[PDB]
Amino acid sequence: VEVLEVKTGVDSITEVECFLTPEMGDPDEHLRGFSKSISISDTFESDSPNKDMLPCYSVARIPLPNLNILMWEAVTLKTEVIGVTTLMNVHSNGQATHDNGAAKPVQGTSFHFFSVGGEALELQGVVFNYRTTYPDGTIFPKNATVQSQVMNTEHKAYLDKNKAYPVECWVPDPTRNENTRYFGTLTGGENVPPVLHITNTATTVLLDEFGVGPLCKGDNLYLSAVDVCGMFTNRSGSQQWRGLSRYFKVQLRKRRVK
Amino acid sequence: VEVLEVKTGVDSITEVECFLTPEMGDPDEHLRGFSKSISISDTFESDSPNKDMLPCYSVARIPLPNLILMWEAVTLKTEVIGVTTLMNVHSNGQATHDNGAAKPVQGTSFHFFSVGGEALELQGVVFNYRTTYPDGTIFPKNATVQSQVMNTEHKAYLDKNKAYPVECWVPDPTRNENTRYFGTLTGGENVPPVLHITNTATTVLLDEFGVGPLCKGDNLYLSAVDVCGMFTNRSGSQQWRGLSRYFKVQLRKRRVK
Amino acid sequence: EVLEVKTGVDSITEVECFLTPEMGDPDEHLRGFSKSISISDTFESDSPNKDMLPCYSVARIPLPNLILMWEAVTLKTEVIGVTTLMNVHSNGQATHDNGAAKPVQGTSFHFFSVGGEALELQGVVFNYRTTYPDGTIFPKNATVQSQVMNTEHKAYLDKNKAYPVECWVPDPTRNENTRYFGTLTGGENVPPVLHITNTATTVLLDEFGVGPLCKGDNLYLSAVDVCGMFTNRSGSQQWRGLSRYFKVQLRKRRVK
Amino acid sequence: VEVLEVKTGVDSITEVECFLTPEMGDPDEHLRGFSKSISISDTFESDSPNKDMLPCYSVARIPLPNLNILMWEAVTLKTEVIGVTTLMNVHSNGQATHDNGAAKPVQGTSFHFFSVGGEALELQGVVFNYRTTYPDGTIFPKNATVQSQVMNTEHKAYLDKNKAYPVECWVPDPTRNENTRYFGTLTGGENVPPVLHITNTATTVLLDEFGVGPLCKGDNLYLSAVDVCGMFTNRSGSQQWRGLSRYFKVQLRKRRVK
Amino acid sequence: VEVLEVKTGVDSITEVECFLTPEMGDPDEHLRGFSKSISISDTFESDSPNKDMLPCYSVARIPLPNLILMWEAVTLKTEVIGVTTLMNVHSNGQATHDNGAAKPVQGTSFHFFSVGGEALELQGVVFNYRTTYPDGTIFPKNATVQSQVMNTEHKAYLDKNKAYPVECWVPDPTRNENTRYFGTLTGGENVPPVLHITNTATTVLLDEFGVGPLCKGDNLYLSAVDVCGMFTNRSGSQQWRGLSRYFKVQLRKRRVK
Ligand SMILES: CC(=O)N[C@H]1[C@H](O[C@@H]2[C@H](O[C@]3(C(=O)O)C[C@H](O)[C@@H](NC(C)=O)[C@H]([C@H](O)[C@H](O)CO)O3)[C@@H](O)[C@H](O[C@H]3[C@H](O)[C@@H](O)[C@H](O)O[C@@H]3CO)O[C@@H]2CO)O[C@H](CO)[C@H](O)[C@@H]1O[C@@H]1O[C@H](CO)[C@H](O)[C@H](O)[C@H]1O
Ligand SMILES: CC(=O)N[C@H]1[C@H](O[C@@H]2[C@H](O[C@]3(C(=O)O)C[C@H](O)[C@@H](NC(C)=O)[C@H]([C@H](O)[C@H](O)CO)O3)[C@@H](O)[C@H](O)O[C@@H]2CO)O[C@H](CO)[C@H](O)[C@@H]1O[C@@H]1O[C@H](CO)[C@H](O)[C@H](O)[C@H]1O
Ligand SMILES: CC(=O)N[C@H]1[C@H](O[C@@H]2[C@H](O[C@]3(C(=O)O)C[C@H](O)[C@@H](NC(C)=O)[C@H]([C@H](O)[C@H](O)CO)O3)[C@@H](O)[C@H](O)O[C@@H]2CO)O[C@H](CO)[C@H](O)[C@@H]1O[C@@H]1O[C@H](CO)[C@H](O)[C@H](O)[C@H]1O
Ligand SMILES: [K+]
Ligand SMILES: [K+]
Numbered sequence A, D: 001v002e003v004l005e006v007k008t009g010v011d012s013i014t015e016v017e018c019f020l021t022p023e024m025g026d027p028d029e030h031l032r033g034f035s036k037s038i039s040i041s042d043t044f045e046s047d048s049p050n051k052d053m054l055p056c057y058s059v060a061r062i063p064l065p066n067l068n069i070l071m072w073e074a075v076t077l078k079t080e081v082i083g084v085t086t087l088m089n090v091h092s093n094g095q096a097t098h099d100n101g102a103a104k105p106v107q108g109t110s111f112h113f114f115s116v117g118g119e120a121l122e123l124q125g126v127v128f129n130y131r132t133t134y135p136d137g138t139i140f141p142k143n144a145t146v147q148s149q150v151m152n153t154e155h156k157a158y159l160d161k162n163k164a165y166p167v168e169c170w171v172p173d174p175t176r177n178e179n180t181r182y183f184g185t186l187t188g189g190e191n192v193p194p195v196l197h198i199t200n201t202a203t204t205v206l207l208d209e210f211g212v213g214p215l216c217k218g219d220n221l222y223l224s225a226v227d228v229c230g231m232f233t234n235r236s237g238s239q240q241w242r243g244l245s246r247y248f249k250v251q252l253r254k255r256r257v258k
Numbered sequence B, E: 001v002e003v004l005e006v007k008t009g010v011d012s013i014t015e016v017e018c019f020l021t022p023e024m025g026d027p028d029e030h031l032r033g034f035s036k037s038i039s040i041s042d043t044f045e046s047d048s049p050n051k052d053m054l055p056c057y058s059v060a061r062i063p064l065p066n067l068i069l070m071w072e073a074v075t076l077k078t079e080v081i082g083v084t085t086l087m088n089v090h091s092n093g094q095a096t097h098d099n100g101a102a103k104p105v106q107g108t109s110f111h112f113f114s115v116g117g118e119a120l121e122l123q124g125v126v127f128n129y130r131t132t133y134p135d136g137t138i139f140p141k142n143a144t145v146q147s148q149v150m151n152t153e154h155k156a157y158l159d160k161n162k163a164y165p166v167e168c169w170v171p172d173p174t175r176n177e178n179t180r181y182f183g184t185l186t187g188g189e190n191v192p193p194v195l196h197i198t199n200t201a202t203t204v205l206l207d208e209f210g211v212g213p214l215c216k217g218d219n220l221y222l223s224a225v226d227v228c229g230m231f232t233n234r235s236g237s238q239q240w241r242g243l244s245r246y247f248k249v250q251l252r253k254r255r256v257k
Numbered sequence C: 001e002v003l004e005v006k007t008g009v010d011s012i013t014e015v016e017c018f019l020t021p022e023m024g025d026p027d028e029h030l031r032g033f034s035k036s037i038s039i040s041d042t043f044e045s046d047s048p049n050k051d052m053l054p055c056y057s058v059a060r061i062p063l064p065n066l067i068l069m070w071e072a073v074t075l076k077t078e079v080i081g082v083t084t085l086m087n088v089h090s091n092g093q094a095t096h097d098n099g100a101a102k103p104v105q106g107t108s109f110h111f112f113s114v115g116g117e118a119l120e121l122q123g124v125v126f127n128y129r130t131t132y133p134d135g136t137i138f139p140k141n142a143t144v145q146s147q148v149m150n151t152e153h154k155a156y157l158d159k160n161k162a163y164p165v166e167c168w169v170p171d172p173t174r175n176e177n178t179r180y181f182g183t184l185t186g187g188e189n190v191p192p193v194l195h196i197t198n199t200a201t202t203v204l205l206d207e208f209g210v211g212p213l214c215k216g217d218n219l220y221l222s223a224v225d226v227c228g229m230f231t232n233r234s235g236s237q238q239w240r241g242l243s244r245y246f247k248v249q250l251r252k253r254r255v256k
């Protein structure tokens, strides 16, 4: 596509506003937003995580007003993690930090990630341990070899289904994704404190170095997210991932292309 | 509402200067600024916190000079009041080691403030949907398991002081177009408070179109939470500790149609 | 009414000085330290000794006699003696067997201000039943409301080694003729992070281009630099503070 | 070299996109991306690490389109660590952080480093311990003396081979490297949390203070990297370095020289 | 001097490139870059550190081309050399836990550098005025209890290498107008070193008037400290570990009156 002028006028702009719920595993009817308690395999060879123990990428495909050549161009993003103050519940079946103390709050490894694109997020598969057996009902790197622990170019995929692509074995493919803007931070360590900021005054500009945002193929906007905030420790010491929803507001304009 | 010109002239500006006290629970006549000591339920379904154990949002509705003109909030200076109180490490706390000073206030903090031309709009989200919030608090009603991530039924206005518990409400990012809000949750049992003070910092409240919050009915709404962390008693029991927040807001008269 | 700045060689002056810390100085050998910290047996019985309480430092500096008033325009400031915290061999508490001594660490408060009059203070107490000791100036008639905000507790930082750090802060409702800056970093294991350089200048002008205007040709400097606590071999702990350098540039301003 | 004007026209620019795999030691056929478990000598003098326990620098020499005097000038870099979310696998033969807890995640000492130049990265040898015996199959500071613990100007080398130059005994030589741009961070400490950021929106400009980027001698571009993320702790407590691959995208333009 | 114009043209600029080795104590023929193991006095009064246990400031005086014109230092690039040595966690250190790797170098650090047209000016400050500093070091003389906070008698020049202990001297902020200095003390026994390297970062040495350090007698003075932390031996004994610092300074000729 050769990119030409922006359309102007009342009709030329539109907005998407929505939220993506986290997909942490949801091990039972009371534990939406949590994973199953984490168990550790006896050996590398025997690593076989159950689906409800594996956080997955969230994705939404948002239909835009039909245009047809014009395409919707995503220009700005406001985004926020929803429910940050829930982590102040340190009185609910947790593990006391010391005798008579409050419960240990959610903490430890986090991944906060979001993207806005004009097509599905492109994924590259990378595994901690290539002998991990990923479970039925997930989509994972197939024919994994030892080289998959560092880089195996066979593992290419699209983030095209919710509750399906486990976080731990996929990343945005930096060799593609030219029509998407993605941003993420993995903060490791078992004791790391969550640090969650909220404001309605911050905008991210989605334009590239040529002044062009993601262009929405087939008039669909793709939003993706992961917000694994840390782990919740219950009184037994067992730990579960806890996630939160992410708010998106995207402003778009119509752009002519050839 | 179409927004038109700003008014000028000596008459056209005003300032609001005040403080909001923290609402940490205040379990007895001696414990203003603290919560009740925190206990832990044996199961999710038995989580039933006492009201005096729950920090709540602070809010103040400030009447402005009667005025279509509307007062437009343009700048904010804000500060946490009494930061140095956290240097009292001698008041029946828990020695960090034999012969040592008391463990200082630390752990989970939430520092939040907002300035708007109407009540802060809230979205309820719960850690655990089977938590029973107590009498005298206002809380997400008809909670379901979906309320643990997002249930759009839980909409409210921060319209009452010491009533909305911090842990089950956040600013609603889907609304709040006429408010500016800012907050940080810093988690962890051992996180050190880091509290900055200065009278030289100003936050501009104008949006991307140059328009600040417009005060409906000539009222300015200020909201805050400043849970600084937990105080650990000698016994090991822990209480939230909060501090007041100073606000100075400058406003100008704006014509609307 | 602030009018024009005077120019010419004669129109500027500089103040350069240091403020020593006032940590309690429990004996003739312990300048810069507090008395070891004890913990009350009950919350109600909190009663810290004077020599256990760090206090605000203040200096009033006379300026050249001058309507014109000296206007403070810039500040350079620095903590003096940051490397002393590398002494980990002076009867401290070994971090483990055969190890060096635990360094100074823990709760710190670093604060400085420059004004044309005394810093204005607001009293706030951690515990309203704390008995503050004879020889200190503290919030009088404290009530439970003093734990969060009691507007009765107003004061001027007008005396050195007197106003305890823990029960006073800069009053944000006043201080229009002062510029102040402070950070409390709390936690028993927090590391000191102390930067020094002679290349960084703070501008003291407000949003209208006006710096503090020095009433009576006096400049007021205040500081706190509680760096953390030193832990003795026995486990007892003392606050340790350090001196602060100030360099302030001033210019003559006409006022009506 | 006198540097003259930049060529223009559609023909005057090119891009290199690739990835460099980590070289952590690879102790067996299942442990690509890991080192051998780390052991400790019994005396300072007897330090003698095995080759498979020593992470090494990665390097790639990338042939560029033939010129000829024109040279390719490297102007911009996008780079990213690939597979950051692998660190979320805390269920694979690790050491529980407490009773019933999840596995301790990868953490501890990290070195993240990358460079782009018009010739091989120039190295200076520095050793923690001059009496360390570096193993056969590595290239290490020769004839080390006590002065080599701080600075011995004899130890000059070029990063010209993979799986050869151990990270711990070489650094970029700050006294040379004028035709290279390098960037690195050592974060030391056994419990340091990894903090890994990903985005496709960040570009580094490689131009120096005269507006000139690395000039590619012989039409070769040199990319180097190290991404030791931390250590993985096994059930028994033994620890292995864990590394990840690094993506590079470099934009180049033709520059006339005399 | 009145500072006049910069000279232009051929031979109006020059560069200095060098490195300064650390002076950590060097307790034997094998331990260049380390201190003697750190011992703790039995009483506060009896503090008496051995010379080889005390890191010292590094200094180099670099002769410039002979020139009134004076060489004016305009820019600096600097780097710590050998940052990756801290990845040696296999050399008779102390395992962090059963079967683990050795504890890496960590804890209290001081990273400092200056560039000036004359010797760095020092002010003495002591942690403990009853500390007996050892023969062969240059230290605050006639120390009194006031020396624990500020005693203006302790003035010195950093005019000798491996002589001025780091712990009892700092740059004198009341002087040093013809030097630019930068440092950071990071304290705590477990602080992680964070060491950045790049050849793309330049510091400009010009003051607010556009004037860099002017080199009296055509000599440039470079000073450094890079105590990276402590190495913990298998036995638990600890030694300071330091690294060399690279300097590249660009200078120009300046006429003065
Ligand atoms: C364990 C011990 O005796 N330490 C004392 C030390 O002895 C020297 C050797 O010990 C180490 C160490 O301190 O652990 C071994 C390390 O690998 C060395 N590390 C490096 C990087 O060199 C350090 C280091 O050289 C010094 O600490 C630097 O000052 O030394 C010890 O193994 C050796 O033992 C000899 C023994 O003397 C001899 O009779 C026997 O036949 O063979 C043994 C093995 O060769 O002796 C070394 C001294 O020659 O020496 C230092 C001197 O500074 C101290 O005396 C240290 O004692 C500890 O000091 C602590 C204070 O930091 C604390 O007070 C402890 O209570 C002391 O035990
Ligand atoms: C030790 C004890 O019995 N704690 C009770 C508490 O009894 C209080 C007094 O205890 C203390 C405390 O918790 O250690 C003493 C402390 O100095 C006080 N601190 C302040 C700043 O006031 C606190 C504080 O007032 C309360 O915790 C606020 O809720 O109280 C005790 O010494 C005295 O004999 O009796 C007093 C009567 O109340 O009462 C609390 C009422 O909420 C609790 O019942 C507390 O029980 C402990 O609670 C822990 C969880 O928070 C845990 O479950 C322990 O097992 C339980 O003993
Ligand atoms: C161990 C002891 O008896 N501590 C007393 C103290 O006695 C001091 C001397 O003790 C020390 C110390 O506290 O360890 C020794 C240390 O090297 C000194 N450090 C410095 C930098 O000078 C300190 C220091 O001078 C004081 O703590 C300052 O207040 O003192 C002791 O070795 C000597 O035999 O006698 C000395 C007194 O003449 O006196 C203190 C007076 O405040 C306390 O009474 C201290 O007792 C401890 O107090 C702690 C908090 O107050 C804590 O509660 C302990 O449980 C308690 O034993
Ligand atoms: K398997
Ligand atoms: K690409």
Ligand SMILES: [K+]
Binding pocket: B044, B045, B046, B047, B048, B130, B131, B132
């Ligand atoms: K309940």
Ligand SMILES: [K+]
Binding pocket: A017, B173, B174, B175
């Ligand atoms: K909205």
Ligand SMILES: [K+]
Binding pocket: C044, C045, C046, C047, C129, C130, C131
């Ligand atoms: K009392």
Ligand SMILES: [K+]
Binding pocket: B017, C172, C173, C174
């Ligand atoms: K005021």
Ligand SMILES: [K+]
Binding pocket: D045, D046, D047, D048, D131, D132, D133
């Ligand atoms: K050896």
Ligand SMILES: [K+]
Binding pocket: D174, D175, D176, D178, E017
């Ligand atoms: K060079």
Ligand SMILES: [K+]
Binding pocket: E045, E046, E047, E048, E130, E131, E132
């Ligand atoms: K002595």
Ligand SMILES: [K+]
Binding pocket: C016, E173, E174, E175, E177
């Ligand atoms: K001076």
